[PDB]
């Protein structure tokens, strides 16, 4: 009898660990069943896929920068001098069965991971889930976004292809080597010398596969533990009060629903990783400091910085026989953006003056000031994302070769203002639509 | 609260309520999906869920079959097996993702069509503790601090802080003391002593009178022998890429020469763009204060590395005499000493003085009069 075996095993577990009281509390936990509450599940589930696929890739990847001659099955690159990082990346795609499928699933999982964080951040921002007592979880999450920001960038540069290597030279090396007073000290420190060096890829490989995921995993564990014990918020409705949770229990509804949603995320990721080609590194060849390609395909989880580089005017300072290049503005710009994002609830509670306990989610239309600001921030992010595909955009109207950036320069203040006004007016209209 | 006698006669329905009451969960509504067993709709829905789950196994078995028995090896463009190879990875993802996606679909259908619908309310005890745990935990921590008498012993307290601080400062410095390198430590042997890496490049002379050739690349730079050129090798409006090559560098035949040639191509400030403007355009040419006599005839040599972020600007418009950087789209007016005219670039490209030797080969007349590449704090 299976019931006899189940009773015997349950008896053995209870006699040794006595978890019946603890398990029953865990099984009776009630979770709200809103559609927007699955936004954080996709990001968490994508991270697991990244962990599983990243482990597989580590069994065939050599992070060395040592110059070697290609001897694989790719005829166009036969005899071409490259690094061990590029050859093993080629080895995974061609001389390993299923390596290309795993490599593309891993890259697609990263895109879904980064996209889900921003979408899930919008839900927290718009619905006011960052208020007390969930202000510390916003800070923990904000660190996760920053860590996942650099984690994807480091991994994308691991194959050391022509496109990825160019980004390291301009972004990682060019911007860092121009930071006031310590910029060259930070460059000789991370690169261990001058670009390219010989410890770049090995240092990033250790950071990308081990150190950053370890911090992310620890922060995710603290993030999930906080939500589990802080009893996730709910939208106002029939029977919804500030001192109760309305939804379904863990068993057997939420456990099955969450488990089946995990399968769909894995199923969707497997479909895109096999059918849609992402980041073909063999078409570009190994990175060479003397060669840079024109037609590229940068990731959307780290492009807004590139768009800010192009749009910002060439403003430089030369104080007393020194130089402050244009790249300092972009590096400083990321500091304010990250600082403002992390400490939003503290600023929000300082201007609104409310520091009370909140468990019921606030309606986006209720606060048109925040809604419009979030829409303005989302709009500003999108133009900065779309400001670096100017090469294709320029050959669409043909009114001028350089007027494309002037559209960005002028249109990075007018369009966000327009989006702010439209969202603010829409919130008030929706407020009184049913009132 | 109930004794063992009551628990014996309690049924499962009341036991679930009793367990939820302790945890604060109140299941206010529980209803089965099918009120009348035996209807055809329930049987039809059961078959639909089975079809989704069976399709997962059929696709999962296909994944095992296509992984084993299918041409997976890479085939070159224009070959008999190229078409079958191009379908290898798509079939790997089609038979894998669709296998588990259908399983997840069949489980969602099961939970919202066969698992009874429920809505449970759980009382959340948020806020401060009920004033009994707060007082006890505060006393427990205060008793440990007061009982240890650490507050009234300043000699131990100050020593502990200084001792822990000194150990922490030493350990932290020693932990990151091996990742701190002076960027201006003279390491590059030049004509005048040893200079820092940023102040030098492949065009920096190593001794007085050293001859450096504007050598072309036969094939890929660093993998093919470098060949010298003469002025009668670039047509009007043409563009050529040159590297700093010495006669003692060899042609890559030997192992030592191959390493030397690789370092030339590995140089981040080594590439230089050589351009020849048409004779009908020398009138509209503006020189730079210090580089008036750097050009040789109608031949100009500007560094290929962009002054903004270090991208080697490969694009060059012969019609407009403009140099375009492919990274951030910066144009440099080659007529006006390669000064920037649009984009985030703010500094003109460095100009390399050039001339000819006794044999007529193009050579570098000297070193750059300014640092090459992106700017930094200690520049100029």
């Amino acid at each position: 009898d299976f019931a006899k075996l189940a009773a015997a095993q349950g008896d053995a577990i209870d006699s040794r660990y006595h978890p019946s009281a603890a398990v029953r509390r865990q099984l009776n936990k009630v979770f709200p069943t809103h559609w927007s509450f699955l936004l954080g599940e996709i990001a968490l589930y994508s991270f697991i896929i990244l962990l599983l696929t990243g482990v597989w890739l580590t069994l065939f990847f050599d992070p060395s920068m040592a110059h070697v001659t290609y001897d694989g099955v790719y005829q166009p690159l036969r005899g071409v001098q490259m690094s061990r990082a590029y050859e093993t990346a080629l080895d995974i795609s061609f001389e390993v069965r299923g390596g290309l499928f795993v490599r593309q699933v891993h890259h697609w999982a990263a895109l879904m991971f980064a996209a889900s964080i921003m979408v899930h951040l919008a839900r927290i921002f718009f619905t006011g889930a960052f208020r007390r007592p969930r202000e510390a979880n916003w800070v923990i999450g904000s660190l996760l976004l920053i860590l996942a920001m650099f984690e994807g960038f480091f991994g994308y540069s691991l194959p050391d292809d022509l496109l990825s290597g160019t980004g390291i030279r301009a972004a990682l090396s060019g911007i860092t080597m121009g930071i006031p007073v310590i910029g060259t000290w930070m460059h000789w420190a991370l690169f261990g010398g001058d670009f390219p060096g010989e410890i770049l890829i090995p240092r990033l490989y250790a950071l990308h596969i081990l150190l950053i995921p370890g911090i992310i995993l620890a922060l995710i564990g603290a993030h999930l533990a906080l939500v589990w014990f802080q009893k996730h918020t709910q939208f106002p409705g029939p029977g919804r009060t500030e001192t109760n949770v309305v939804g379904v229990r863990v068993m057997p509804v939420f456990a099955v629903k969450s488990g089946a949603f995990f399968a769909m995320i894995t199923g969707v990721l497997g479909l895109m990783g096999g059918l849609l080609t992402i980041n073909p590194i063999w078409n570009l060849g190994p990175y060479k400091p003397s060669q840079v390609s024109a037609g590229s395909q940068p990731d959307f989880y780290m492009m807004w910085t590139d768009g800010l580089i192009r749009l910002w005017p060439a403003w430089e300072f030369y104080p007393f026989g020194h130089t402050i290049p244009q790249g300092v503005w972009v590096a400083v710009g990321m500091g304010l953006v990250f600082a403002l994002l992390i400490a939003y609830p503290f600023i929000e509670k300082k201007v609104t003056g409310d520091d009370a306990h909140h468990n019921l989610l606030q309606r986006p239309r209720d606060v048109p000031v925040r809604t419009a600001i979030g829409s303005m921030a989302i709009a500003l992010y999108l133009l900065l994302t779309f400001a670096c595909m100017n090469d294709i955009i320029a050959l669409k109207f043909h009114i001028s070769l350089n007027a494309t950036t002037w559209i960005g320069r002028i249109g990075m203040v007018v369009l966000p203002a327009i989006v702010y006004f439209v969202a603010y007016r829409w919130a008030i209209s929706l407020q009184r639509s049913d009132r | 609260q109930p004794t063992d006698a009551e628990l014996a006669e309690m049924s499962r329905e009341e036991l679930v309520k009793l367990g939820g009451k302790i945890d604060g969960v109140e299941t206010i509504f529980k209803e089965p999906r099918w009120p009348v067993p035996g209807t055809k709709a329930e049987k039809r829905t059961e078959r639909l869920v089975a079809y989704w789950l069976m399709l997962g196994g059929l696709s999962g078995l296909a994944l095992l079959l296509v992984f084993l028995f299918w041409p997976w090896e890479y085939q070159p463009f224009g070959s008999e097996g190229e078409f079958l190879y191009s379908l290898a990875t798509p079939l790997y993802g089609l038979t894998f993702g669709l296998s588990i996606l259908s399983i997840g679909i069949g489980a969602v259908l099961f939970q919202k069509k066969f698992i009874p619908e429920e809505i449970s309310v759980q009382d959340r005890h948020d806020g401060r503790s009920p004033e009994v745990h707060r007082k006890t935990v505060a006393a427990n921590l205060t008793d440990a601090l007061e009982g240890s008498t650490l507050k009234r012993r300043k000699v131990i307290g100050l020593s502990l802080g200084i001792g822990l601080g000194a150990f922490g400062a030493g350990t932290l410095v020693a932990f990151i003391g091996g990742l701190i390198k002076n960027p201006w430590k003279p390491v590059v042997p030049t004509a005048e002593g040893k200079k820092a890496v940023l102040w030098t490049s492949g065009w920096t002379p190593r001794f007085k009178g050293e001859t450096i050739y504007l050598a072309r690349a036969t094939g890929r730079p660093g993998e093919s022998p470098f060949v010298k050129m003469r002025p009668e090798d670039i047509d009007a409006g043409g563009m050529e890429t040159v590297f700093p090559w010495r006669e003692s560098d060899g042609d890559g035949t030997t192992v030592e020469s191959e390493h030397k040639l690789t370092e030339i191509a590995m140089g981040v400030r080594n590439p230089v763009m050589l351009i020849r403007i048409k004779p009908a355009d020398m009138h509209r040419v503006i020189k730079r204060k210090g580089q008036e006599s750097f050009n040789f005839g109608e031949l100009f040599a500007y560094t290929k590395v962009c002054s903004h972020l270090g991208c080697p600007s490969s694009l060059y418009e012969q019609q407009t005499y403009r140099i375009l950087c492919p990274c951030h789209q910066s144009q440099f007016d080659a007529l006006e000493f390669a000064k920037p005219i649009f984009g985030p670039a703010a500094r003109a490209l460095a100009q390399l003085p050039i001339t000819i030797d006794e044999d007529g080969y193009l050579v570098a007349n000297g070193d750059f009069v300014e640092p090459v590449g992106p700017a930094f704090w200690e520049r100029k």
Binding site: Y318 | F207, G209, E292, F296, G297, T355, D357, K380
Partner: peptide
């Protein structure tokens, strides 16, 4: 700001002399 060490010149340029080459080793 404008780079102080970057200004145009109006003085005509002279043809560079031929390179001779002094060998140190």
């Amino acid at each position: 700001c404008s780079p102080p060490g970057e200004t145009a010149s109006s003085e005509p340029g002279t043809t560079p002399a031929i390179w001779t080459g002094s060998p140190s080793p």
